Enzyme design. Structure first.
Site, mmCIF file in Angstrom:
data_model
loop_
_atom_site.group_PDB
_atom_site.id
_atom_site.type_symbol
_atom_site.label_atom_id
_atom_site.label_comp_id
_atom_site.label_asym_id
_atom_site.label_seq_id
_atom_site.Cartn_x
_atom_site.Cartn_y
_atom_site.Cartn_z
ATOM 1 N N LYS A 234 -3.776 5.174 0.650
ATOM 2 C CA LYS A 234 -4.313 5.336 -0.699
ATOM 3 C C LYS A 234 -3.257 6.696 -0.902
ATOM 4 C CE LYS A 234 -8.922 5.046 -0.342
ATOM 5 N NZ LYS A 234 -9.798 4.067 -1.787
ATOM 6 N N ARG B 106 -16.054 -3.990 0.657
ATOM 7 C CA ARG B 106 -17.180 -5.264 0.498
ATOM 8 C C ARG B 106 -17.130 -6.030 1.664
ATOM 9 N NH1 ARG B 106 -12.937 -6.682 -4.163
ATOM 10 N NH2 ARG B 106 -13.148 -4.352 -4.563
ATOM 11 N N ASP C 23 -7.402 -2.031 1.374
ATOM 12 C CA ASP C 23 -8.536 -0.464 0.605
ATOM 13 C C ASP C 23 -9.751 -1.105 0.278
ATOM 14 O OD1 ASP C 23 -9.030 1.690 -0.304
ATOM 15 O OD2 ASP C 23 -7.700 1.970 -1.849
HETATM 16 ZN ZN LIG Z 1 -11.439 1.090 -0.031
HETATM 17 ZN ZN LIG Z 2 -14.006 2.324 0.379
#
Ligand SMILES: [Zn+2]
Ligand SMILES: [Zn+2]
Ligand SMILES: [Zn+2]
Ligand SMILES: [Zn+2]
Ligand SMILES: [Zn+2]
Ligand SMILES: [Zn+2]
Ligand SMILES: [Zn+2]
Ligand SMILES: [Zn+2]
Lengths: 507, 507, 503, 509
Positions: free
Chosen positions: A290, A367, A363
């Protein structure tokens, strides 16, 4: 308690949790606005008024009541959120505080207006040190919305001081017409408040305090406090269950993976429910770090908000103890970090149901952990599976920061979530699972990719991916990526605790 | 025939429009699948089949019918989109083309499957030059979806050649289906609905040097004459008299004068509706130029897609001529360019309803033109106002490219739009107008800003701004920014024509 | 149509051009280093030596046999003052040339720079001793680059003949072979200096109108035929691609067409130069970091190189060759009248073009120039232009790329590059990328959907406007401007002249 | 050393490799188009035709042959990639499958057209259940391009299913009918070997980085050397430290997998050129601390940064199977992984190569040339005649030559033209690019002898070649940059580019 690994001796080894709040020392009475008028003898007296409407009730104090009958509120409009307070002498020549708080036009009050009124009211409480507070409800307000008002009032009143180096209110009187119709909501407000307060405490804890080990330790302590069955699965058993997707996300972390499984079994005087919360204690993004402008890496301690909402609901159900209901509270907890041992973009991993996944973006790890959690949940043989997770940042561009999104494979289950959204006053909006995007998850080599090649609708794509791990159980997915954290106030909302609790109780 | 201004003599002065398509020379007949079986005489015979289902129909030709009985389709399995075609000799020694097209699992066909089947079938037609085509429907399909299949079939079949520097098409189409009499009413409707979509797609696909505010208003005049509609084009001076300061500010920087299209239909007296379409013939963004990566400035000729869907609907209504309804077709047409005369970021403009607007971003110009169009529409005294516009690119991150979003202030009108979506088979999803974001539009100096300061839910915000220009009329807003242009195919869809036409006809 | 339109009275109305340089006042002579030995006398005497090789007249011919610290490496230099037979005066300098017999255009550019640095920091009589073996073509290049580095461009300074050398003597073994290269150097230098002056001229001075007037002036000086086509004639010729680019400019389009015809005692050539006097990018504005909008006055470098070669050919006047010098000149600006991204325009050959990017405007103007050149019935068509910034990532800032449809023409360009010492490298036109220029609605798109090999795509586009004539395309986007020196090179003038004179 | 380390027990410990393809069970025959005309008796018959050219060959079945003499091409142009299929009753009244396939204008077929024709026919084989196939070549093809047609046919026919969770019906008989068939019969066995070598390299590249790591990849080389009987030598970290390969070892410092240097050796029978083939072998390139985070850096596809190593090993299979005489070949790859860790080398570090030269690391994502540096030094110490390296080096290749043509640099004109000649006969396109000496100063360092990147010259492909040349002293050396051509972006699979190119280069010397 399992020992938390440390790098230096100064690293913390527990999550500080306040199991007692000023609300526990608060008396709360509902009194009829007319037959039990407020005495105005000490403390604060707050009138909740609509726009351009004058005060209509009375106080037993003659001096104060004569002032009110003059009908001079200066420039107070009743406009939503506006405030006016002052001190004035009583009949015993004590100085009490009078206050007007605007609630907007009459008969148009929703959760939005309630939150604004409760916030403006708490501003006056933080600026004072009263022992008694009287709230005069000169508005029409439904029972569940009245309870929500008290929940949010307490949410804004109790500050979090656990990480600062550095005599609250003791009596609360609520004056409203038909008071008897609201008394059943008071102690429900106590439970719902603390569950939300517990969730926020877990979310606000920094990632060096709240790691997979300490967070699992906190769920163990929680289960004992509200009398729940507790099971913590460790890596070896996770390997035996073949949870390859969930184990791959944690490869790069110094903290071992911990799978929380709490169970509530009510008295038999039928329905079995699985609640799954995303529990990433810190999401750096992995090698898909990120680093882009606006990726908010400094706030990624909140990627376990789903898990916190499930544990907060575990407190509520464990305290209320409903009958004829069995609930499993699940969360595959881990940490997504950059290391020589991390899983890489392009890796192909095998989920616990045999499906292979090509990791197009590390990232999109939430899920992956939910996939193995969903397979685990369906193996329990439950009637409904509901997951809640800070999944897609695209939620900020669709519904935004107020409304969460719900997807599912069963219209009846979706409608139950929407109903619980109404009685809990946590806003949720139904979004579709668009089958036309499914092909963008295809992989040349694996069964699936975890991200889409073509489709920009990330929230819909992510729901399609999760759907691949439910064979034929009614399932719903609540994306709280936009509503979990209050960016303006810089604090968590504890979103989802009351929504999930209402869903379990009405069922 | 208003003169179109030119920079050089080579600049075009009209929009080339095909008022005649190969479908106008094609015979269409629906025949019973068993009582009027296909003869396999000549041309192409296409079997539409579900997964793992054998052919059950029969052809009158004994040679081919005997071939079909062997039941060997090689590796064609019926999976959606797949196809197998070949040439084979019939009873008269003439070579016939047989084909199987997969429609997916049985009883699960939706607008998605149908579009894929029609596309796979047209692939065979474009690779051929048959004079007769016979489609054998061995699937269960509802009447409205059967009509949609034909509309999309033609949509993929007729290619746009207007701008290539460079009779030859099918002449007879036979449709073999069980209980054929129930589907015959759809054919003529398919013919009109198709050309309405085809007409809208031609205006959208026309480049901006061909389709400018003058030439597009000229086309609207011609259209109104060809389907007998009242027509009126307001010019700058009248627009100044009506004080359309927002609409006029957007066009200040363009070499083409603004043109407000107003078409009107009135059926036999044997409801009053206003339809507004956004009509930016080219959106450069203004001084907030579309320079960021991914802003797709080369495609911004499509920012008049709303206007195109309204005019396409006008063709359909002006042709079908329904009774007991009055419809006004509106579009505030202009061009958003960069110039010494352009309006600047930060300018404060006044709308026709007196409200002042601070322009936080010149690339949010559509809502400014719609604002004066909504005020104009409500002055007409109509029962419903529906607008359709390529407003916010955020729709790509919420609903994506397949589903349009609808907002509104009236649940009964929103549901009428949803119902029109099911019978038109143009998907639409209901999205909320969240009042918590309204304060994000406040301006320190003007009544409103046109863009939000804090909220990133761009589509919700835009709907809150448009709502400020509807006083007391049921109003709905359809955001087609995501669905209007097919990015993969590099062509428009004509989205909205059949949705809006179904809306007018149903009530 | 010949006066430059102005926004304010102070806007310039013509391009200042120096038609006379200090080199025109400089006498040059080639002397054999052995036969007519260098007479030391008084002045500056420069020694061009290789690495680890030591020098081999008045007093100091016994000063002939000390320099230490100076190793002869490429670019190194020294200084000294001498006795003399008469006595009391001079300067004498060593300048290295690197290892022997390894001298190319690179080494000599740096040797010439070091020698000019001596002169810039100091006399009237200079002698250069060539103790290096260099062939005749590279010898002319040394003098061409020496003059290039020596003459400074002061037209746009505010500050205000006696500042420059007046006598230059060159001592070299077998000096009789080099004597013919002196006047060729004078011609080639000024052609390159002239092209550089047009490129360096800011866009408010050099615009379509003033640049065409400069072409009118140049043609008059060498008696070249000159025809300037105006908008009305370009419209009837249907040059919709070229005219679309200039729609948003305050300056009318000007199509330059000069013609040279040598004395007949055959070959017809067409030279096309891209002439965008300023490239803002259009509505596809140059706003991203690295787009170099402040230097986009150099997008007429091709036209500059073509006009510079017109000077050389008009001056040398070779026999049996007809040359056409062409440039569709215009300005790419942002305005209410500009063409938009996505517009479909019609070229002069009837092909429709979708404008996927208004910053790919050069190839639109060249498309109409190519169609125009082919209609002249010539044997070869050569275009030179600052097309694609991808060249910086391909060959870089030293080598230009050449594409074409005819191997024999391409090898003639390559050989001209060798004798002109303007480096060029052959790149392929890969037909697999042709499909990426297909447009859903027009015949062609001007940019590619999927292929990033952008210099190859651009050549595929240009090829669509040549039907059946040998054609080569030289992309000079990377070599035209010297970024570290902040000045143009005039690249292409000598290369194109060599191609014409060798025919 | 041979054990694959794991973080969890579910981590794979081997690269799955298909050593048997359906091609190994397919009979192939070349028959003369005239003296041994197809019978059209059974199966599927495909005619390869040029645009606007009638069927000229005949067939034994009189019914089918009569159908052929009659056009029946009413919608078939012979346009490239177009087709038309028929079901036709033969003399014995059984239906036969017959198809036309367009190959474009006559005498204009190149590798581009052949690739499209091969693809078009794989569709017909997938859409047909006939297991006997006859291809009639009514087009003019030279031997090498004819071989390329079969190689690409196999490449598109076989699919990689090693990582699917689901799950052998293929063609069993293939008859190729062409004029002067005797001249093409030798290309069949060659196409078989060339195909699997390409297919093998593509399998190594497609393998994800958690399957294909430095250990499992070197182990695969060991297995390959056994199956094809080559000498195998794997150098581990300790020996690499003794050889002072600081550049190569610095890149792998931040990886959980130890560096592995593969050295395979083929020695042909004596009846004497020595070749060294070096492949870049970065099993995953995150970029290091110079992380691949910028838009378009394609970090999810960087499992292909060992495409050079794969091409070299694929060549080793071909040479090990064909076994040419009087040639000695060395197959080298300095394999490692470029990761982010507390142990990684940092931007700005100064490291020492095995030839003594010091290198300032201006960018950790330019690590491929650092591993090649020590591999080039190692290779020249072997005393060979030619050194050829192949590597996915510069992303700039996508902006210069693009996705179709690789770039070749070198210090020897004779070797470069041998690579170009191998490119024409292998039909793997390559284009010669210059090593421009003027950019050399851009690599100088204020403190080290060299920087690994330039901060002024943007022609990164040329700059990288200048860097690598600093580690070859006096041996003919060529460098093939396949960063743009290795991976088929539209098809989302590797090409196995370089196997056939390098094999042709070895065989014809
Ligand atoms: Zn993520
Ligand atoms: Zn996450
Ligand atoms: Zn806009
Ligand atoms: Zn717009
Ligand atoms: Zn440009
Ligand atoms: Zn340009
Ligand atoms: Zn790298
Ligand atoms: Zn690399």
């Amino acid at each position: 308690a399992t020992t938390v690994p440390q790098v230096v001796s100064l690293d913390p080894t527990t999550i500080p949790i306040d199991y007692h709040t000023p609300i526990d020392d608060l008396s709360i009475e509902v009194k009829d606005i007319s037959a039990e008028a407020c005495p105005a003898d000490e403390g604060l007296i707050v009138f909740l008024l609509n726009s351009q409407i004058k005060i209509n009730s009375s106080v037993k104090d003659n001096t104060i009541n004569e002032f009110l009958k003059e009908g001079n509120m200066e420039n107070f409009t009743g406009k939503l959120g506006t405030s006016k307070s002052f001190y004035i002498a009583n009949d015993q020549k004590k100085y009490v505080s009078l206050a007007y708080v605007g609630c907007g036009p009459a008969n148009e009050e929703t959760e939005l207006e309630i939150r604004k009124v409760a916030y403006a009211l708490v501003t006056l409480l933080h600026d004072s040190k009263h022992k008694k507070v009287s709230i005069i409800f000169e508005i029409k307000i439904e029972e569940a919305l009245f309870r929500f008002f008290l929940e949010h009032l307490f949410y804004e009143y109790v500050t979090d001081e656990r990480f600062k180096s550095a005599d609250f209110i003791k009596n609360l009187s609520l004056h409203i017409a038909n008071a008897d119709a609201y008394k059943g909501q008071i102690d429900k407000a106590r439970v719902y408040f603390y569950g939300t307060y517990y969730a926020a405490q877990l979310i606000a804890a920094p990632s060096n305090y709240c790691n997979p080990v300490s967070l699992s330790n906190a769920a163990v302590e929680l289960a004992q406090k509200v009398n729940l069955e507790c099971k913590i699965l460790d890596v070896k058993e996770l390997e035996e269950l073949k949870m390859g997707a969930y184990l791959s996300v944690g490869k790069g972390s110094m903290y071992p993976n911990k799978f929380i499984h709490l169970t509530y079994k009510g008295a038999q005087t039928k329905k079995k429910i699985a609640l799954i919360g995303k529990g990433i204690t810190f999401d750096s993004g992995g090698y898909n770090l990120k680093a882009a402008p606006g990726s908010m890496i400094d706030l990624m301690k909140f990627d376990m908000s789903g898990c916190a909402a499930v544990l907060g609901c575990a407190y509520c159900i464990g305290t209320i103890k409903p009958d004829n209901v069995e609930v499993h509270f699940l969360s595959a907890v881990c940490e997504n970090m950059v290391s020589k041992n991390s899983y890489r973009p392009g890796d192909i991993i095998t989920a616990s149901n045999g499906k292979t996944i090509e990791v197009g973006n590390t990232d999109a790890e939430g899920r992956l952990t939910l996939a193995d959690a969903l397979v685990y949940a369906e193996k329990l043989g439950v009637d409904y599976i509901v997951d809640i997770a800070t999944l897609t940042g695209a939620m900020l561009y669709s519904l935004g920061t107020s409304y969460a999104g719900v997807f599912g494979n069963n219209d009846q289950l979706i409608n139950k979530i929407l109903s619980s959204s109404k009685t809990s006053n946590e806003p949720v909006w139904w979004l579709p699972i668009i089958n036309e995007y499914r092909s963008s998850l295809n992989s040349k080599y694996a069964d699936l990719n975890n991200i889409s090649s073509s489709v920009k609708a990330s929230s819909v794509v992510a729901s399609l991916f999760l759907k691949e791990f439910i064979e034929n159980t009614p399932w719903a997915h609540i994306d709280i990526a936009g509503v979990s954290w209050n960016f303006k106030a810089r604090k968590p909302k504890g979103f989802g605790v009351r929504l999930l609790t209402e869903f379990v109780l009405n069922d």
